[PDB]
Amino acid sequence: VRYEASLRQLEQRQLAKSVISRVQSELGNPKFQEKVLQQSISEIEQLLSK
Amino acid sequence: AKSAANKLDWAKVISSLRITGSTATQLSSFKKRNDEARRQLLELQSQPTEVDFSHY
Amino acid sequence: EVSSILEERIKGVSDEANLNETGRVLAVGDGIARVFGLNNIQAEELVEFSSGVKGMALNLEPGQVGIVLFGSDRLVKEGELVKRTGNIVDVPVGPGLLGRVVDALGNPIDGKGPIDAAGRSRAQVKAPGILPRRSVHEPVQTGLKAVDALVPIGRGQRELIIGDRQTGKTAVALDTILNQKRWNNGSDESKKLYCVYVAVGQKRSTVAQLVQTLEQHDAMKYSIIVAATASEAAPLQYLAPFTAASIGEWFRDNGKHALIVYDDLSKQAVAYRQLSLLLRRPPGREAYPGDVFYLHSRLLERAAKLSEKEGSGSLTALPVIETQGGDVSAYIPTNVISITDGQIFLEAELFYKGIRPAINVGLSVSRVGSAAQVKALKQVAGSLKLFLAQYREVAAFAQSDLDASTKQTLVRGERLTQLLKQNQYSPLATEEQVPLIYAGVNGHLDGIELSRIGEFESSFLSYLKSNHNELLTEIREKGELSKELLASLKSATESFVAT
Amino acid sequence: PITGKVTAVIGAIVDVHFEQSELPAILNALEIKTPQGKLVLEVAQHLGENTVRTIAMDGTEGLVRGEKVLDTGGPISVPVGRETLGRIINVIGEPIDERGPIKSKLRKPIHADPPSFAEQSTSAEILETGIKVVDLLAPYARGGKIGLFGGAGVGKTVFIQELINNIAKAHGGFSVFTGVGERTREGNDLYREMKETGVINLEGESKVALVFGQMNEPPGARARVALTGLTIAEYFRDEEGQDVLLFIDNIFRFTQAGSEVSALLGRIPSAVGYQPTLATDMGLLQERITTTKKGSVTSVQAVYVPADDLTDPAPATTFAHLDATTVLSRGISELGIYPAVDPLDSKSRLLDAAVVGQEHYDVASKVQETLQTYKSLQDIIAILGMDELSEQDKLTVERARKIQRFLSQPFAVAEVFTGIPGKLVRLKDTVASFKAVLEGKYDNIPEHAFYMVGGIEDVVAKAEKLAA
Amino acid sequence: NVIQDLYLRELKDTKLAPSTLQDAEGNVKPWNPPQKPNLPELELQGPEALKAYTEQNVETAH
């Protein structure tokens, strides 16, 4: 049981490092550019909602 | 049962007072009391005899 | 599995931020930050930094606002944008905090899910008015001989527990929680207490052992633990008693009787000292802050027994003071003593010399604690406190020609001292205490030589139950002795004493 | 390139001004290139105006204000691994063993957060030590802080060495002797002794890793030696799954060093001159000693009383963290007893009926009661005469002086030093031994034939040899 | 947005870690079999006992 719980924690840190790897991929892509456009239009909507 | 045994144990102590050369008979009865209490403490100490599987 | 929990979390981040106020940090460090902007800030608000740490604005100055960091400096960086939480420092309060270890922010450190909490309520609040107070009359039973009658405690009552460092100070309080296991496993809501154990300035390991102890004694289900370990940031520790007391007030304001044990306020003093010095405010007396009296008084006076009109609740308070060098003269101890009504000073010499717990009766007093008492244990125990402070005097000059009058008193006193002794983590029924005290007061423990007094006590209790548990059942319901009970006790005590 | 020019050097407090939008963070590591190689300064404030305030870990002499600084970021990262076993490394994590660069796979930041509430283990198990005396009168336990008292020359070093030997047999764990402002004369000796007793052996086995503090090194570097040691230990505990035992030298000098750093950082000195940040500094240090689910560090710390004041805040704060106190005395050593442990002054948190086992507790309580009565009985027995002993009293005298001798056991490390091969006696057998002595089974054999005997088994042998 | 990028990526790309029973075995205490019936053997046996007790029964009880 103890190792089973340990394995859940170990999996959590492994998949955490996979998330970091995904971050490095995201900031590379010109999704970085296209999502800035997404932020831009969203900010327009927010600021117009004020 | 065990209470009969212990009545005879302590009865034999006050009888053994009255018999010299039988001064280590009472130590054997004391030993019998000892191990009786030891096994009784074993039996009371006892684990459940089955694997847990409703939490395990 | 783990994937589903991750998915729940990613789904659990939603909606883009809508903010319209911020400040930007100037200089930061020393656990104080100086922020530029936030001109619309409320005073003593909670602000959230971009580092994710939160702090309470203390000094609103014309050009800067000085946040106090409830957290670690490493997290924060200069020139970060601090956005106002928008709420004065409040902590979740509600029923579902019951049986949960929490840190002072209210983050469950037992991590038994997110806390189920009715509300949140501001950390600082003014104590109930004069008119909202009804004088105490319902006792809390401690199951410890002397505590439960020589130094009796009420409900809503504020009475100090003071004494030597790590004399297992904590244990006295634990025993109270344990004694009230059958009260709190009771169905009478009036008899239900809900106890909060505030652990301040304590090792996280030690607290975990306490938690495990409590959960071994299955007491957790009626109790909350607030934890503010030594590692946790010094301002957070400062805010820790206040926050705990808010939780207590929610119970109190359900009109339900409760208790809160603040172990140890001495560590709150050191914490406030750190904060004050880091706020560069001049050291107060004994180098402890000048507002240290105010700190304690605002905390302490929140404990109350609400008036019948305005509920009926209580929040009993016992605050645990770690006396440095065991000398009660000292600014922090005396300041507390003046606030509290009654003290439970403990004497180390006696503690070492096997009175567990060793309740010094020279420096233990109880004032309005004796207005909540079981009448039976008032009748039997009458003036015994005086007698054993005559024993104290007698043995003062015993160490000489001893008059027969003094010698008789000494003989009684010594025998009584044996009677006082308790065995830690063994709480005693109130009913059971009544015959034992009768015996000693009526001097029947002359009849048992001092060495065998302990044997007598246990045997006497076994005798009492076997001979007539009718008496104890009567004291269980009546709670006040009658002539019949008094005679029955004279008869029963003489009978057992003989054998 | 995060670089900045030195804009003050008032004391060892060096303020570095960085070019905009490249601002450090608190607890970052800055390295100033110098003909002293580098000086590693650790950022301990942000003073604004794109300037910081740092503390130094190496002397600030000859700095020219405006020197280029390089920001390495985060807390100083010291190499860790089994590669670092038996290497003396200074605070910056560089060889002072002079055996040159230590190739260790990972390096890790010196500041690290204490384990969570959840990660604290819910029970403290008695760590065994071959010394019966230790296992009787103050049982050590996982995550424990055991505060040494007594003076060096009683065999402090030998006691510590013995523990290392014991730990190797007992667990096969590791140790790290961390010396806070260690006297360099003593440091030479320790290295030589440790080499000699082979707990460090060149290509041989190396258990204990050495971090030696130096009083000539700045107060800041005195503060950081402890944290460096703590990290090494945590790598062992968490990432090598091994129990560790971490010695600390004076924690008086831990406090003393901290007090200076506060004053340098400019803060109102708190009572008895001690730092305002006193509590927090001990709190971080002594909450990374815990019993994790991977391992447990255990720490034996040395408390050098400040002018015998036990009222002083620095001792008080220490005692709060401490779990056990081992009170070595020279009086005991003068009664020929090695262990030097004073039996009626040593106490541990763990030593309760349930905690250390009922049998062990009862045995211990009796042996303690016996010794306690023996000393007191001897007060007026010696004066009045030994003939004034009651049958009851001389039973106690007989038992006690035999127990007192039975306590004496050689140390494996001190096999050479006493001349007698050590006796590493297990916990189970310690209890067994005292039970027999309590039952008077043993104590019919001479007092000197319990001198320097190991366990119960050993004094069977000595009885035979005594006769022979 | 970023939520979507993270969500998609995390879920889709998700790693599988080792979870072999063999690896698990190393990290746990291994199953022990039954403790074996053994034999309960009781004292007082042989004609050693018989001669001994007949002989022992001669000490007059005074």
Q: Give me the CATH number covering residue D222.
A: 3.40.50.300
Select from C329, C198, C168 the least CA-distant residue to C265. C198
The answer to whether the CB of D312 falls within 8 A of the CB of D318 is: no
The residues, ordered by sequence, that sit 6+ positions from D2 with a Cβ below 8 Å of its Cβ are: D18, D22, D24, D70, D71, D73
After which residues does chain C have a break in its backbone, defined as C to next N over 2.5 Å? 399
Are residue D21 and residue D153 in the same domain, yes or no? no
Assess whether D338 and D363 both reside in one domain. Answer: no
Antiparallel, parallel or unpaired: β C32-37 and C23-29: antiparallel
Query: How far is E30 from E45, CA to CA, in rounded Å?
Result: 41
Instruction: Based on the fold, state whether residues D16 and D105 are members of the same structural domain.
Output: no
Whether residue D310 is found in the same domain as residue D397: no
Tokens of D376: 């007191």
Known binding residue C362? Answer is no
Structural tokens at position C160 = 């100090």
In chain D, how many domains are there? 3
| Residue C367 in tokens | 């004032």
Q: Which of C463, C419, C468, C424 is nearest to C441 (CA)?
A: C419
DSSP string over A27-44: TTSTHHHHHHHHHHHHHH
For D383, the token pair is 């004066």
What CA–CA distance (Å, rounded) separates C145 from C152?
Answer: 10
| Residue C53 contacts residue C69 (beta carbons within 8 Å) | yes
Boundary-marking domain end, from D75, D105, D129: D75
SS3 labels along chain D: CCEEEEEEEECCEEEEEECCCCCCCCCCEEEEEECCEEEEEEEEEECCCCEEEEEECCCCCCCCCCCEEEECCCCCEEEECHHHCCCEECCCCCECCCCCCCCCCEEEECCCCCCCCCCCCCCCCEECCCCHHHHHHCCEECCCEEEEECCCCCCHHHHHHHHHHHHHHHCCCCEEEEECCCCHHHHHHHHHHHHHCCCCCCCCCCCEEEEECCCCCCHHHHHHHHHHHHHHHHHHHHHCCCCCCEEEEECHHHHHHHHHHHHHHCCCCCHHHCCCCHHHHHHHHCCCCCECCCCECCEEEECCCCCCCCCCHHHHHHHHHCCEEEEECHHHHCCCCCCCECCCCCEECCCCCCCCCHHHHHHHHHHHHHHHHHHHHHHHHHHHCHHHCCHHHHHHHHHHHHHHHHHCCCCCCCHHHHCCCCCCCCHHHHHHHHHHHHCCCCCCCCHHHCCCCCCHHHHHHHHHHHHC
CA D1 – CA D4 distance, rounded (Å): 9
CA–CA separation, D127 and D289 (whole Å): 14
The answer to whether the CB atoms of E6 and C16 lie below 8 A apart is: no
For chain E, state the CA radius of gyration: 36
- Separation of alpha carbons A2 and A19, rounded Å: 26
Q: Is E7 exposed, middle or buried (0-12, 13-18, 19+ CB in 10 A)?
A: middle
Tell if the CB–CB gap between C20 and A50 is shorter than 8 Å: yes
Task: Look at phi and psi of residue D141 and say left if phi exceeds 0, alpha if psi is from -120 to 50, else beta.
Answer: beta
Question: Domain holding D58: CATH number?
Answer: 2.40.10.170
Closest CA to C247 of C101, C114, C132: C101
CB atoms within 10 A of CB E31: 6
The length of chain C in residues reads 499
**Which residue type occupies C65?**
V
Instruction: Give C324's contacts (C-beta < 8 A, 6+ positions apart).
Output: C165, C266, C330, D311, D313, D316
C-proximal residues of D, 303-332, CB under 8 Å = 310-311, 313, 316, 319-321
Q: Choose which CATH entry (3.30.450.20, 1.10.150.120, 1.10.150.20, 1.20.150.20) describes domain C374-499.
A: 1.20.150.20
User: Is residue C262 within 8 Å of residue C319, measured between CB atoms?
Assistant: yes
Q: How far apart are CA C212 and CA C217, in angstroms?
A: 9
Q: Which residue of A has its CA nearest to E10?
A: A19
Neighbours of D313 (CB within 10 A): 20
CA distance D257 to D220: 7
- Sorted by where each begins, the domain ranges of chain C are 15-87, 88-373, 374-499
Lookup: tokens for C268: 């709150």
State the Cα–Cα distance between residues B42 and B24, nearest whole angstrom. Answer: 27
Q: Do residues D100 and D69 share a domain?
A: no
3-state secondary structure at position A46: helix
d(CA D237, CA D114): 13
C64 HSE (CA, 13 A, CB side): 11
Residues 6 or more apart from E49 whose CB is under 8 A from it?
Answer: none
E60 contacts in chain B (CB < 8 Å): 21
Instruction: Give exposure, C214-235, as e/b (b: 16+ Cβ within 10 Å).
Output: beeeebbebbbbbbbbbbbbbb
**Residues ≥6 apart with Cβ < 8 Å to C158:** C300, C301, C303, C316, C317, C318, C319, C339, C340, C341
Which residue segment(s) compose the domain that D1 sits in? 1-75
- Residues D16, D92 within the same domain: no
Using CA atoms, how far apart are residues C118 and C189, in angstroms rounded to an integer?
20
From the list D176, D254, D246, D159, the residue with the least C-alpha distance to D210 is D176
Say whether both D382 and D437 belong to one domain: yes
- D27 and D67 part of one domain: yes
In chain B, the largest separation of any two C-alpha atoms, in whole Å, equals: 61
- The domain boundary, picked from D334, D350, D366, lies at D350
Residues 6+ apart with CB under 8 A from C435: C460, C464, C471, C472, C489, C492, C493
Statement to judge: residues D169 and D233 lie in one domain: yes
Give the separation between CA D404 and CA D362, rounded to whole angstroms: 18
Rounded-to-10 torsion of CA D209, D214, D217, D222? 70
Q: Which residues does residue D145 pair with via DSSP β-bridges, in sequence order?
A: D299
Structure tokens at C209: 């052992």
- The Cα–Cα gap between C254 and C312 comes to 9
Beta bridge partner(s), residue D16: D6, D52
Q: Which of C209, C187, C175, C183 is nearest to C101 (CA)?
A: C209
Residues in Cβ contact with D402 at an 8 Å cutoff, skipping those fewer than 6 apart: D437, D442, D443, D445, D447, D450
List CB contacts (< 8 A) between D47 and chain C: 27, 29
Q: On the CB side of D295, how many CA atoms lie within 13 Å of its CA?
A: 22
Instruction: DSSP letter for B18, please.
Output: T
CATH fourth-level superfamily of C88-373: P-loop containing nucleotide triphosphate hydrolases (3.40.50.300)
Specify whether D85 is located in the same domain as D198: yes
Q: Three-state SS for B55? A: coil
- For residue C229, say whether it is annotated as part of any ligand binding site: no
> Cβ of D320 and C30 within 8 Å?
no
Among D23, D55, D75, the domain boundary falls at D75
Closest CA to D215 of D267, D259, D158, D254: D254
Q: Are strands C223-228 and C101-103 parallel, antiparallel or unpaired?
A: parallel
As a whole number of angstroms, the distance between CA C445 and CA C454 comes to 11
- DSSP lists the bridge partners of residue D292 as none
Q: Do B19 and E62 touch (CB under 8 A)?
A: yes
Whether A15 contacts chain E with CB within 8 A: yes
In the numeric block, which tokens belong to residue D409?
Answer: 């056991």
The residue assigned the tokens 């003050």 is: D8
d(CA C104, CA D207) in angstroms, rounded, equals: 42
Phi, psi of C18 (to 5 degrees): -135, 110
Q: What is the experimental method? A: cryo-EM
For the domain with range C15-87, which CATH number is right: 2.40.30.20, 3.30.1490.20, 3.40.50.300, 3.30.499.10?
A: 2.40.30.20
Q: Would you state the structure tokens that stand for residue D371, as one six-digit string? A: 């010794």
Q: Closest to E27 (Cβ–Cβ): which among A3, A38, A39?
A: A3
Asked if E11 is an interface residue toward chain C (Cβ–Cβ < 8 A), one would say: yes
Cα D211–Cα D61–Cα D15 angle in degrees, nearest 5: 90
